[PDB]
């Protein structure tokens with residue numbers, strides 16, 4: 001996350017971190033329930049085998065609240081392709097259930113029509129992750145969050161050198177130096193409504209990080225709600 | 235109208251039969267007033283944790 005703030009105790013409980021063999025975090029994810037994690041499909045190519053850590057806010061040490069979970073089943077969207085980054089979504093089922101607690105809780109899945117007319121028409125959303133704090137920098141050891149304004153769909157298409165499909169949306173600033181970045185992928189983009197946070201996006205991609213005239217691109221969760229339900233049901 | 239302050243609903247709002255019908259996400263039960271969403275456990279979805 002470039003700019004923004006540090007997630008304080010209990011502020012970003014639905015955040016999940018995918019870690020590789022060396023216990024290094026390479027992508028984020030969102031806690032949907034005790035057994036399910038939402039993430040980006042392009043994160044499944046960033047590492048051979050990986051585990052999911054919840055409750056962490058600082059990777060430099062072990063507070064005692066963190067918790068690691070093995071991945072039982074991996075459900076990647078079949079239509080995903082690195083060529084367009086379209087359908088950049090995946091759901092992970094854990095072997096053991098997450099123990100909800102301080103810093104560990106799920107984000108709510110909204111209904112499609114309500115989400116699109118009431119959540120995505122809000123001024124801002126919130127993105128978080130352990131990603132880079134600068135375009136060329138390293139992974140952050142502290143979990144960060146950032147209020148990102150929803151971006152007019154038209155303005156976004158005109159600013160992008162790549163196609164913005166109906167399965168993605170944009171958020172962030174035109175020139176202000178705040179944006180998600182590499183390492184935040186798969187992470188949550190949630191929208192607040194009356195003190196309740198609903199999953200609305202998945203950190204997907206962007207041309208650089210916080211670059212002027214460029215926005216952050218996210219997978220439009222409302223476009224995959226049925227797909228998500230199926231993944232969690234079956 | 236659900237277009238009017240979300241129909242006074244806490245969460246999901248539907249305009250069924252020209253009238254408001256509120257519903258909630260999993261982990262909540264609709265209140266007696268048919269608008270508010272009441273959590274069922276200590277960690278309902280979408281709530282930051284104070285403890």
Ligand SMILES: N=C(N)c1ccc(CNC(=O)CNC(=O)[C@@H](COCc2ccccc2)NS(=O)(=O)Cc2ccccc2)cc1
Pocket residue numbers: 042082083084085135136162179180181182183184185203204205206207208209210215216217
């Ligand atoms: N909000 C954000 N700003 C943001 C958030 C998350 C991520 C993580 N995900 C990725 O990087 C997916 N890879 C890309 O985006 C490529 C290719 O982008 C073009 C494209 C090709 C085909 C189809 C669609 C788009 N860009 S980069 O500029 O090389 C990415 C980078 C930026 C900084 C350091 C390292 C790499 C990145 C930026």
Ligand SMILES: [Ca+2]
Pocket residue numbers: 056057058059060061062063066
């Ligand atoms: Ca820690």
Ligand SMILES: [Ca+2]
Pocket residue numbers: 172173174175176210211212213214215
């Ligand atoms: Ca920008």
